[PDB]
């Protein structure tokens, strides 16, 4: 007779509890690194939020690809446990060495003089791409912070959570991991703010952000060591399933042949279309919103404190949306649920763009509501991003990992692997390539606002007319089998 606590088997609590706590610690570091990497590249002197479009395509896109080939080559010469110590520990070493060594010694290694010479000979519209060379070590931090969410979150954990949880355990407790992932946004958001508030202790030239940064990178090491400690616990005290070698000798189906499969199957092309549209449009709004953020919070510490507040608000909103997701679904349907994220993104983004653009002959509201137009833009963009992401993880991702079900477990297993590592970087990089062309054609990101709103309609229109193309293929396969 197996014992039970809280209506759940004790034997499966030793697996799920350290797994959700480890997912908590992973999203705790992620919520700290993702706020920090925006502080570094945007609030750096000589750098603005226009470095983001060029970081996504020219810097971290080749590094993310180059990381996926190093990981793929290491996935054959290392064991499963050795793989989750060679890909997780250099991250902990890097961020610990950054806040304590690399960042302090950054006015020693950043070519501020050469970047200024390049800035004059090229023009004012090149501050974006040139800042990549100006603060290159901050750009390397940006890549590693991106690679945390791309590898530690998406690859390392879910690759380990899927190899140890039963198919029915992965169906009941995975919705609870996302719930606990946003508790790691409320807390780490409060953590980021607490360590971002400038200590009343002033310095002659003491960087208030240097002491603030290493107070965060210490927790990243501290929580990163908990991930390695929890992972070691679950791999020695938890009896894992004995699923044999028989998983179709997993042939990760290259890249070119991968999107060849994409176009071949009409069911996967639309899903990839949704996954890239969310990733183009979110960037199209978010980079301009971060430009406004830089305008409102020039200091690194004020920007970081706002990032912590924003992370806490995002966590609360996403927790509420995950709670009401399995009422929206059950009431309205997959087709309705797949439309809100495009719709919320479109509406919030166009409201934010029409407050930036048509903010001139509309300002009694922002005036009597106790704000400046810049602060109003900051708050509207923050609400845009909060609603878009709380819809993402509560309606879009549920729709994505619900549309896989009616597919055959060969097409499903290959297509699901093809979606993540391709479409997520592909969407996040195309949405930035668009903005690179915008910046280098119209000069600044603010001169690109009328068009950034118009590509937003085009991407969302193809995003809306791809779920309907899938609401009718999801319904077809899920009804005929009945």
């Amino acid at each position: 007779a197996s014992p039970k606590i809280f209506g759940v088997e004790v034997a499966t609590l030793k697996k799920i509890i350290p797994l959700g706590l480890m997912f908590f610690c992973i999203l705790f570091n992620y919520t700290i690194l993702r706020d920090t990497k925006d502080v570094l590249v945007v609030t750096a002197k000589g750098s603005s939020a226009e470095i983001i479009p060029f970081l996504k395509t020219w810097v971290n896109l080749p590094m993310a690809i180059g990381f996926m080939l190093l990981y793929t080559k290491l996935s054959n010469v290392l064991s499963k446990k050795a793989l989750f110590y060679t890909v997780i520990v250099p991250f902990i070493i890097y961020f610990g060495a950054f806040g304590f060594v690399m960042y302090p010694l950054s006015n020693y290694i950043h070519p501020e003089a050469l970047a200024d010479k390049l800035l004059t000979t090229l023009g004012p519209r090149f501050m974006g791409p040139i800042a990549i060379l100006r603060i290159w070590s901050f750009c390397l931090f940006y890549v590693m912070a991106e690679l945390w969410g791309s590898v530690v979150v998406s690859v390392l954990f879910w690759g380990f959570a899927n190899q140890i949880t039963t198919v029915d355990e992965a169906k009941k407790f995975y919705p609870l991991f996302g719930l606990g992932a946003n508790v790691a946004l409320i807390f780490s958001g409060r953590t980021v703010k607490y360590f971002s508030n400038l200590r009343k202790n002033l310095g002659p030239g003491v960087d208030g952000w240097a002491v603030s940064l290493k107070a965060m990178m210490s927790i990243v090491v501290g929580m990163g060591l908990a991930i390695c400690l929890l992972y070691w616990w679950v791999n020695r005290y938890v009896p894992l399933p004995t699923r044999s070698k028989n998983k179709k000798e997993k042939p990760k189906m290259g890249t070119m042949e991968s999107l060849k499969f994409l176009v071949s199957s009409p069911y996967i092309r639309d899903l990839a279309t949704l996954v890239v549209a969310y990733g183009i449009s979110i960037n199209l709004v978010e980079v301009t919103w971060k430009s406004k953020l830089k305008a409102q919070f020039p200091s690194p510490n004020e920007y970081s404190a706002f990032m912590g507040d924003f992370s806490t608000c995002t966590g609360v909103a996403t927790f509420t949306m995950m709670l009401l997701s399995q009422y929206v679904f059950n009431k309205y349907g997959w087709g309705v649920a797949a439309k809100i994220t495009p719709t919320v993104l479109l509406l919030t983004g166009v409201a934010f763009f029409s407050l930036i653009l048509f903010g001139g002959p509309f300002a009694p509201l922002v005036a009597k509501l106790g704000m400046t137009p810049l602060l109003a833009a900051v708050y509207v963009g923050a609400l845009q991003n909060i609603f878009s992401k709380s819809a993402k993880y509560s309606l879009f991702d549920p729709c994505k990992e619900m549309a896989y079900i009616p597919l055959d477990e060969d097409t499903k297993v290959k297509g699901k692997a093809a979606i993540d590592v391709v479409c997520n970087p592909l969407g996040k990089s195309g949405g930035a390539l668009i903005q690179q062309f915008m910046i280098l054609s119209f000069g600044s990101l603010a001169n690109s606002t009328p068009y950034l709103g118009m590509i937003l309609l085009v991407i969302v229109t193809a995003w809306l007319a791809a779920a309907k193309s899938l609401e009718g293929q999801f319904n077809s396969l899920r009804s005929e089998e009945e």
Partner: nanobody, 120 residues
Framework: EVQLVESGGGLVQAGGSLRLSCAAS????????MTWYRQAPGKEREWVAA???????RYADSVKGRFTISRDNSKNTVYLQMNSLKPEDTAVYYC??????????????WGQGTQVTVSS
């Protein structure tokens, strides 16, 4: 139409301070790349300081630490805070807004300049 009007110039003693204003009309100063020049008689026009739309500031080696360029977004005015003024700083200071890609100058608007003379 773009218009740059400088003010705040005058006669000050060596080691004094002076603040030049540049009331911009026809474009927002926050999205512009604005620069300060100076030209003494006999010598060619010399670039002094430059501010970017990002708020990034550059200064010539002759005025680093002493001069500070800044803009007020409400009044649409850039400022040149000249501190520890030397007699070598005596020149006509020009407010300039321009945009260019390499050697193609898309626009280049100058002000009429203000006379800054430092006595001794």
């Amino acid at each position: 139409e773009v218009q740059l009007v400088e003010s705040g110039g005058g006669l000050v003693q060596a080691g004094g301070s002076l603040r030049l204003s540049c009331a911009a009309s026809g474009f927002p100063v926050d999205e512009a790349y604005m620069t300060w020049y100076r030209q003494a008689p006999g010598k060619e026009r010399e670039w002094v300081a430059a501010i970017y739309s990002s708020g990034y500031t550059r200064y010539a080696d002759s005025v680093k630490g002493r001069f500070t360029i800044s803009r007020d977004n409400s009044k649409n005015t850039v400022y040149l805070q000249m501190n520890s003024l030397k007699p070598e700083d005596t020149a006509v200071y020009y407010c300039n807004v321009k945009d260019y890609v390499y050697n193609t100058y898309l626009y280049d608007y100058w002000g009429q300049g203000t006379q800054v003379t430092v006595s001794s």
